[PDB]
Structures are given as structure tokens and as C-alpha cells.
């Protein structure tokens, strides 16, 4: 499901003053790091099975 989409067009106690807003958010390209030790502290290092 590429895409998500809003919208929202006329009257909101206007002067007739009518616009048609589509929002719309397009998902792209996956990345993958490698698995890391975020420490509560804030230092990160490479995490490794047996840590």
C-alpha cells in the first residue's frame, strides 16, 4: 500500500472559498544497518550474539 492519501475541500464557514487538499506520503527505498548496543548512557558499538 505505496501511498497514504487525505483530503479535505469546501465550506468551513467561508466565503465560498473552495480548495481541495489532498495529503499524500509516498513510501520508498528499505535500508538495513547491522545490529547495534545503543547503551543507556548513548555510546553505541557493533552488538554481536554472545554480548
Request: glycine share 4%; charged share 30%.
Amino acid at each position: 500500500e505505496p501511498r497514504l492519501i487525505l483530503d479535505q475541500p469546501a465550506q468551513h464557514t467561508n466565503e465560498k472559498d473552495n480548495i481541495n487538499k489532498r495529503y499524500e506520503i509516498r513510501f520508498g527505498k528499505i535500508y538495513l544497518s547491522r545490529p547495534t548496543m545503543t547503551e543507556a548512557d548513548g555510546t553505541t558499538h557493533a552488538m554481536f550474539p554472545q554480548e
